[PDB]
Amino acid sequence: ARRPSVIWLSFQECTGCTESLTRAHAPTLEDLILDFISLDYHHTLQAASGEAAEAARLQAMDENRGQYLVIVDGSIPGPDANPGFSTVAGHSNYSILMETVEHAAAVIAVGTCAAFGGLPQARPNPTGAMSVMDLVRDKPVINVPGCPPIPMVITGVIAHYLVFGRLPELDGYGRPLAFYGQSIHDRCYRRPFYDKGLFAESFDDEGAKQGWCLYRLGCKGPTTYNACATMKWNDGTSWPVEAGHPCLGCSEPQFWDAGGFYEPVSVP
Amino acid sequence: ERIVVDPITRIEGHLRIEAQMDGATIAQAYSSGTMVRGIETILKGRDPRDAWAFVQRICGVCTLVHGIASVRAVEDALRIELPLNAQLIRNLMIGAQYIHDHVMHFYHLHALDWVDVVSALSADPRATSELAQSISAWPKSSPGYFADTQKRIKTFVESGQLGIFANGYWGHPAYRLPPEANLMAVAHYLEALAWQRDTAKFHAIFGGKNPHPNFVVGGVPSPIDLDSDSALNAKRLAEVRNLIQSMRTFVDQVYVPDTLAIAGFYKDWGERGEGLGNFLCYGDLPTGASLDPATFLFPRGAILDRDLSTIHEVDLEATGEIQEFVNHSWYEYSVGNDRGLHPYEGQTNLEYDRRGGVAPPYKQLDVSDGYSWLKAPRWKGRSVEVGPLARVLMLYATGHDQARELVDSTLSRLDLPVDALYSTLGRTAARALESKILVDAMQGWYDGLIANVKSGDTKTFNETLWEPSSWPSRAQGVGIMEAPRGALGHWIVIEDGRIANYQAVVPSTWNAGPRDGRGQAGAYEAALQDNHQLVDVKQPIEILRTIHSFDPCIACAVH
Ligand code: SF4
Ligand code: SF4
Ligand code: F3S
Ligand SMILES: [Cl-]
Ligand SMILES: [Mg+2]
Numbered sequence: 006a007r008r009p010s011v012i013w014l015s016f017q018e019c020t021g022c023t024e025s026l027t028r029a030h031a032p033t034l035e036d037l038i039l040d041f042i043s044l045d046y047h048h049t050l051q052a053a054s055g056e057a058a059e060a061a062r063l064q065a066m067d068e069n070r071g072q073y074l075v076i077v078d079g080s081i082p083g084p085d086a087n088p089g090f091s092t093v094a095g096h097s098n099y100s101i102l103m104e105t106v107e108h109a110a111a112v113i114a115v116g117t118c119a120a121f122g123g124l125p126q127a128r129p130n131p132t133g134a135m136s137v138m139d140l141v142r143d144k145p146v147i148n149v150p151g152c153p154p155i156p157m158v159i160t161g162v163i164a165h166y167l168v169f170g171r172l173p174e175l176d177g178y179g180r181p182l183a184f185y186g187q188s189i190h191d192r193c194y195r196r197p198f199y200d201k202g203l204f205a206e207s208f209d210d211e212g213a214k215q216g217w218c219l220y221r222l223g224c225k226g227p228t229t230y231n232a233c234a235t236m237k238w239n240d241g242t243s244w245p246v247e248a249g250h251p252c253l254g255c256s257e258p259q260f261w262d263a264g265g266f267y268e269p270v271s272v273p
Numbered sequence: 274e275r276i277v278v279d280p281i282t283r284i285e286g287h288l289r290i291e292a293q294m295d296g297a298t299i300a301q302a303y304s305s306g307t308m309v310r311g312i313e314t315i316l317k318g319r320d321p322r323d324a325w326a327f328v329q330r331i332c333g334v335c336t337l338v339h340g341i342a343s344v345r346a347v348e349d350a351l352r353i354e355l356p357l358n359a360q361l362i363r364n365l366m367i368g369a370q371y372i373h374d375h376v377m378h379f380y381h382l383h384a385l386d387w388v389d390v391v392s393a394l395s396a397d398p399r400a401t402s403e404l405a406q407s408i409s410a411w412p413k414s415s416p417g418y419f420a421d422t423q424k425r426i427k428t429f430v431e432s433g434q435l436g437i438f439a440n441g442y443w444g445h446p447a448y449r450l451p452p453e454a455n456l457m458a459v460a461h462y463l464e465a466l467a468w469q470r471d472t473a474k475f476h477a478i479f480g481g482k483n484p485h486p487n488f489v490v491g492g493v494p495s496p497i498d499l500d501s502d503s504a505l506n507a508k509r510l511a512e513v514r515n516l517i518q519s520m521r522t523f524v525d526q527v528y529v530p531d532t533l534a535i536a537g538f539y540k541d542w543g544e545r546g547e548g549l550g551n552f553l554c555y556g557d558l559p560t561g562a563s564l565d566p567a568t569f570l571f572p573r574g575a576i577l578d579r580d581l582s583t584i585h586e587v588d589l590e591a592t593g594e595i596q597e598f599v600n601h602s603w604y605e606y607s608v609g610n611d612r613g614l615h616p617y618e619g620q621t622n623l624e625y626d627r628r629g630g631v632a633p634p635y636k637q638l639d640v641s642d643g644y645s646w647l648k649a650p651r652w653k654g655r656s657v658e659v660g661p662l663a664r665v666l667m668l669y670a671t672g673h674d675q676a677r678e679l680v681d682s683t684l685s686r687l688d689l690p691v692d693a694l695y696s697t698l699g700r701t702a703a704r705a706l707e708s709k710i711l712v713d714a715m716q717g718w719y720d721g722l723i724a725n726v727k728s729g730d731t732k733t734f735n736e737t738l739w740e741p742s743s744w745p746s747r748a749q750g751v752g753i754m755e756a757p758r759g760a761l762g763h764w765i766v767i768e769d770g771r772i773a774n775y776q777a778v779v780p781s782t783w784n785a786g787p788r789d790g791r792g793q794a795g796a797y798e799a800a801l802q803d804n805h806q807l808v809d810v811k812q813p814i815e816i817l818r819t820i821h822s823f824d825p826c827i828a829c830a831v832h
Contacts, residue, residue, distance in 0.1 A: 008434055017310055019828045020285045021333025021484040027377075028470045028483065035466050039425060043434040051282035052385050052441030054817060058282050061439045088633040089603075089625035091308040093287060094279045095635040098308075124310065124330045131311035131623055153333060153484055156470075194503075208489055208734040209496040216503025239477040240470075247503070248481035250494035253326055261327065265320040 008040075009167065010065050010073035012105060013047040016098040017091050017125040017134055018079030021153040022116040023049050028156035030240045032164055041167055045073075059094050066105060074166070075109040077102065077137050080118040080125040084140075086133025102140060111145040111172065112137060115159060117256060120148035120179070127261035138179060145172060148179040152255035155232055156239070158184045178258070180230065189226035189252050192234035195219065208249055223267035224251035231256040275637060276810045279307070281820060283382040285334040286827030288785065290816055291638055292801065297808070299816075302794070302801035304785050305638055306827045309603075309646040313621040313832060316775040320741070321347045321767055324775060325488045328763065331777065332829045336484040337370045337476065338756035339763070339777070339829075345564065346763040347490045350750025356732040357562040359492035361722040362479055364558055365513075366486065367754075368711045368718070369475040372520050374757040375661075375708045376528050378824045380458075380465040383701065386818045387535055388450060388458040391443035394427050396452035401460075404453045408534050411526040413464060422460045442812040449538045458535070461527055468523045475516045478509055492734030497726055510723065517715045524712045532705040536687055536698060543689050546697030546819040548799030551655050552576045552663035553783070555587065555762060557755035558714070570714060571664050571755045572671050575652060579695060581670040587652075589751045589762060592618070597648040597778060600790040601640070603628045604648065611790050613651060616764035617749060619776030646831040647786040649795065650778050656789075658796040659759025659780045660823065665703035666694065668710070675713070679706045697800070697822040704824070741770035756780055758824050781830035784823050797823060 015023070027034050038044045045065035051058045065073060081098045082090040088097035106112050114137040117123040125134035138146050149162050162181055165173050173181035190196060195218045198204075204221045205212035218224070226234075229252050233244040245252055251267070254260035264270070279289035287308035293301040316327055325343035332339065341363060348355070355363075398420035405414040430438070442448075450458070473483040479495050480486020487494050498504035556566050556573030566573045574584035588594050596613030599606055605624040606612055614620060624630075628643030638644045651657075668676035683702055684691065693699055738744065749766040759780030766774040784796040794802065800819050807815050 019333045024484045050437045054282045055278040057440035089630040097633045207736040214496045214498035214504045238482040239474045242474040242477040245481035248495045250487035266323045
């Protein structure tokens with residue numbers, strides 16, 4: 006102990022959230038790992054496999070009791086679902102979650118699956134998937150949703166916690182205000198076009214080419230909270246609506262089940 | 274009883290290997306995927322235009338490839354032809370995904386099997402610079418740079434918080450590189466992380482974000498208008514050009530020469546780790562607008578029994594040809610658990626308990642019935658291998674000039690015969706060689722995009738069948754793709770505007786999938802059964818080298 010310990014649990018994930026983390030330009034994952042944290046367990050990157058890998062997670066939990074951070078990627082089949090739907094080293098994800106968070110300082114649920122249930126939880130939920138906050142109640146939990154979240158939102162939250170020595174201020178769903186405090190639609194560069202009644206009617210008509218609003222093609226920006234419209238993606242390169250596709254709503258609970266992606270809602 | 278490695282790390286997703294040992298020799302191996310989501314079941318009833326966004330989230334390491342297979346499946350079902358610019362843009366995004374994904378597989382997932390990080394701390398920084406410089410023109414090679422890299426790793430290791438290096442297999446006799454080569458590879462590992470996050474900007478330009486860019490059925494969502502503030506224009510196209518150049522440089526100067534220099538110390542790995550002899554490609558990457566297999570950069574076909582003189586034809590729709598079996602998988606088929614289903618008739622009914630799944634906490638699988646969440650795909654009853662080795666063999670067999678030159682000059686440098694391709698080494702080498710082929714092709718598709726736009730065609734989306742009311746009330750189609758891990762297909766059946774069935778068969782499904790009703794092993798299992806010995810069952814680096822050479826992805830394999 007001396008760099009704070011971080012344990013990364015990967016459950017029913019697609020590994021998008023870890024890839025996103027490796028995209029972040031500041032602080033980079035390598036600077037974090039060498040200089041700022043001690044990333045003590047992470048399946049994607051671990052030299053050791055099998056019991057040597059499991060022993061590293063357990064020794065981290067032993068030596069940093071009360072102090073380590075847990076980051077969880079993916080939904081977890083709940084304790085009423087078959088323990089065999091998702092296991093590591095012969096234990097269920099649910100068992101590993103509860104045992105690893107028991108002595109954490111805090112838990113970050115990264116990605117909409119961990120935060121809210123996400124894809125494995127979309128109808129009809131064949132594996133009884135659940136979110137971290139539903140399963141873990143006696144711990145501070147920070148939700149950092151998105152599918153995946155923006156890379157510099159992930160490291161932004163981590164840098165906040167490490168540099169300023171506290172949890173970010175959260176909205177009612179446990180999401181950091183700095184990144185999730187404003188809707189896409191209240192920041193979107195097509196918004197004044199929306200308000201003038203200028204809309205694209207396909208992906209490459211005059212309105213699409215000119216950056217008219219994507220509302221008629223299904224955009225869920227009006228009810229979606231994320232930093233894409235201001236911070237943008239991949240070191241400020243672009244974001245989904247700037248590249249010509251409607252926002253899918255991918256940082257909102259149950260966004261997979263909001264009717265079709267290409268259908269407008271019934272009002273605002 | 275069996276030796277167990279669970280988790281396999283440095284892959285994507287959740288993989289357990291069990292091995293029945295005979296002395297130091299692997300006698301039987303078993304490959305088990307230990308997480309399922311049932312995305313196929315999630316899709317039923319939904320809009321086919323939305324499918325791509327769901328199945329892209331099968332996997333964020335091979336991000337893009339299920340989006341592409343999905344919109345192609347819909348386009349196949351509905352017979353939508355793409356505009357040329359859409360097809361070029363898709364090729365460019367596919368090439369960018371291969372290059373990103375292979376380079377990170379090699380450094381960040383595979384290389385710690387071959388590279389001893391503790392040994393790098395002993396290297397002389399000057400000798401490390403001489404070696405780097407004797408193999409490559411890559412600029413970043415100064416002795417002070419190697420000494421500064423070594424010092425950062427030395428401070429880390431000496432802090433006593435070894436992080437992802439803790440309990441590693443450092444000093445195992447399977448590690449053979451000199452300290453200098455280890456330090457060089459570690460420096461390149463770190464350069465590859467900076468390079469990859471820059472490369473990812475390419476998908477963000479066309480697709481809005483990476484991971485998980487956007488797609489649409491019928492074209493690409495990003496329009497082209499040179500006179501617009503909100504479309505692809507000369508400014509955005511100039512950024513794309515620079516990204517292709519940094520891709521080319523990193524492949525030519527860092528990834529390929531490192532793969533070749535490291536291979537020279539592991540030539541005996543050219544004699545193990547390929548136990549099937551059969552390879553399958555659907556092919557991909559057309560020169561023009563139409564998805565016509567005659568124009569593919571990667572050809573469609575199958576090789577049987579290591580015979581490169583006959584390419585067997587592949588039919589994606591023949592119900593006796595591609596089938597998935599569940600004789601040793603945790604699934605129930607209404608036709609009987611011994612039957613194979615073609616994916617138009619696929620079924621995904623999860624059944625752990627009744628198929629012999631063992632209740633956690635457990636120490637051993639029961640391998641007499643279901644032992645995996647992977648289905649077992651077979652091609653006309655055969656176990657096959659897909660992925661870079663299958664592609665490079667197909668290219669070689671069909672007379673692709675550049676592939677032939679690269680394969681010949683590689684084997685010649687290593688002094689190895691053609692049959693060393695059929696191995697853990699050859700697979701790892703194939704991955705690097707096909708990266709070189711793809712990175713050279715990128716310039717041709719980019720130039721063809723610019724020329725097409727310059728001549729006045731700025732179309733990017735065929736709207737004609739966008740509305741469900743324009744579709745037949747029954748349609749079915751297959752979307753094929755050569756994903757970085759191998760042949761990928763999505764079979765869709767559409768009824769009355771809705772998904773009636775959707776079945777994915779994914780490259781790591783083929784390779785990692787378990788035994789079938791004849792006891793015929795899958796690629797990983799037959800690979801471990803081919804000429805492997807473990808020095809130490811607690812540090813099974815020999816298993817990892819071969820398993821990692823397939824670049825496993827279990828979120829893809831199981832979905
Ligand atoms: S939120 Fe999306 S990107 Fe992250 S694990 Fe869930 S599916 Fe993957
Ligand atoms: S509907 Fe979408 S595209 Fe239109 S202004 Fe709102 S967020 Fe932007
Ligand atoms: S789909 Fe997701 S990435 Fe941003 S623009 Fe919409 S919240
Ligand atoms: Cl970013
Ligand atoms: Mg499937």
